[PDB]
Amino acid sequence: MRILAIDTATEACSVALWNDGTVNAHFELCPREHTQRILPMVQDILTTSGTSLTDINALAYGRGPGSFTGVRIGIGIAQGLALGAELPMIGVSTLMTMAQGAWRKNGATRVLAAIDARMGEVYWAEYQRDENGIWHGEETEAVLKPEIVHERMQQLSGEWVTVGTGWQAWPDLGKESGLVLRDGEVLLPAAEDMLPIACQMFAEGKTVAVEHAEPVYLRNNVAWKKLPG
């Protein structure tokens, strides 16, 4: 097994539960309403699936990147629930969640994920699924300017599927890349797509205690210039 997944990193608010064989999922667009909707959503899915927080084996959470506030709501709720019910935590990439979503919808195995990071940048990732369902490319996650995304695309080849709000913000992002680009039909991460990544992570003992849960912001130059000297 039993894994509860939570995500609030983007405009979406989603909850999913893997009851071992069974998937109960709830996805919704929550602009300006994440803090009002996430706990009733967690309670509904626990009611629906007939599972209790104590009977959950792990708490999967949207570690980021995305909105700073949104990433924190996710980790904040997840930390509170994991501390309260004594559960291990699994930090799942929102760029990898979308990679998984594209595979679920149309079998995409080669995903170029792009989230609008604001400030003219995108949170970028190049994800490639192997024969055993493992997404390779976690090391390619970076906050990039469109020109640097173009450079990254010059070092790649073949057919790729585009996923996320960065392609919506920059529709000409893959212009003259030399790649074959198709729409992945995934704009936002869904907690339902975190579950298979998290099942794999739990099995491999890649779970942390609540005090070790960490967000992935990618953008760390968030402060005004330091004082002289």
Partner 1 sequence: MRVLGIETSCDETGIAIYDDEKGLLANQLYSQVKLHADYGGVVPELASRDHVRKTVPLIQAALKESGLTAKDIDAVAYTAGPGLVGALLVGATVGRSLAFAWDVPAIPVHHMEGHLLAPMLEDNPPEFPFVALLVSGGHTQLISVTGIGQYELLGESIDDAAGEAFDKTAKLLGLDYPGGPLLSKMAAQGTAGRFVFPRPMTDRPGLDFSFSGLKTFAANTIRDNGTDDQTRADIARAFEDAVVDTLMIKCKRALDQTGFKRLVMAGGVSANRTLRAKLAEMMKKRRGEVFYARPEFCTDNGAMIAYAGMVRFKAGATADLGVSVRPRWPLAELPAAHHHHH
Ligand X SMILES: Nc1ncnc2c1ncn2[C@@H]1O[C@H](COP(=O)(O)O)[C@@H](O)[C@H]1O
Q: Give the residues lining the site for ligand X (CB under 6 A).
A: 30-35, 67-70
- 58-64 and 3-7: which strand pairing? parallel
Residue from 22, 36, 154, 168 touching partner 1 (CB under 8 A): that is: 36
Whichever of 23 and 119 has its CB closer to ligand X, that residue is 119
Distance CA 195, CA 23 (A): 9
Question: Does residue 179 contact residue 158 with C-beta atoms inside 8 Å?
Answer: yes
* Residue 208 burial by Cβ neighbours in a 10 Å radius (0-12, 13-18, 19+): middle
Among the listed ranges 69-77, 150-158, 165-173, 195-203, the one in contact with partner 1 (CB under 8 A) is: 69-77
Residue from 19, 48, 79, 140 touching partner 1 (CB under 8 A): that is: 79
Instruction: Tokens for 76, please give them.
Output: 């904040």
Core vs surface per residue 47-76: b (16+ CB within 10 A) or e: eebebebeebebbbbbbbbbbeebbbbbbb
Whichever of 22 and 36 has its CB closer to partner 1, that residue is 36
Please state the closest distance from residue 220 (CB atom) to partner 1, in A: 9
Kindly list the residues in this chain that would bind Na ion in the complex (CB under 5 A): 52-53
Kindly list the residues in this chain that would bind partner 1 in the complex (CB under 8 A): 35-36, 38-40, 42-43, 53, 68-69, 72-73, 75-81, 83-85, 210-211, 213, 215, 217, 222-224, 226-227
